[PDB]
């Protein structure tokens with residue numbers, strides 16, 4: 001019997017946060033906003049609670065949970081060997097970045113870190129998350145709030161679709177600012193590795209880390225709607241695809257809305273952050289509409305659209321080069 005409690009994103013009612021914190025203490029799972037996507041969270045020091053997360057999501061035990069912290073002091077407790085990167089961290093945290101470090105903490109059980117010697121750590125730039133973590137008094141382990149294979153929840157409607165009646169409490173602070181999961185950068189190797197593109201853009205990371213490695217899986221793509229997804233990187237074949245795949249809805253930019261019959265305008269090329277903010281909602285809207293095929297325009301592999309394309313690639317049933 002799920003409670004949905006709305007809070008202001010800037011100055012949330014601390015009485016609501018206290019209630020969430022009490023649930024966390026009881027080893028319960030809750031859902032809460034961040035600046036990236038909604039999180040489904042539990043006490044990071046509680047094995048049995050974090051196991052519930054994997055179950056609710058239907059997630060493989062080998063995929064570790066990101067551990068959310070509110071301070072640099074907490075970092076010192078849970079990770080080691082990051083001291084050379086402190087300048088970097090202080091430039092991007094709090095913020096839409098997860099970093100991989102060597103695990104130090106004894107309190108975070110294997111289940112959270114998937115038995116790995118590393119820990120994924122994020123300090124979220126969202127007052128609700130920060131205040132919740134601080135008030136609760138432990139780090140929170142939290143992947144995105146969605147059934148695995150479905151698009152990451154960027155608002156409470158999506159969370160309800162996936163989890164109503166499955167968790168005691170959802171904190172609603174509206175649509176998430178970015179709409180996309182945090183950039184993940186691994187810093188435990190000779191050269192830093194990008195494991196997931198996000199709001200901290202590749203171009204910016206390459207400025208700070210000239211030797212940044214971008215593995216094949218990142219460039220070549222999980223996040224999927226319930227109807228076959230056709231991603232069209234070559235927009236010359238757009239004409240051909242529409243006819244090939246007949247029973248269709250389109251997701252397209254503002255600047256080409258007029259070129260289609262039934263089309264969700266995800267956002268404009270002029271403000272690509274709009275596209276990122278809305279892409280997952282668009283996937284969820286499109287699946288509900290009464291069409292057999294979801295057809296999505298591809299975007300530049302640059303800036304935030306890099307991350308968008310990464311997500312669309314991992315979701316597509318067919319890509320059209």
Ligand SMILES: C[C@@H](O)[C@H](N)C(=O)O
Pocket residue numbers: 034036037038039040066098122124142143144145180181182
């Ligand atoms: C919940 C949210 O913080 C997510 N784990 C991310 O890294 O974007």
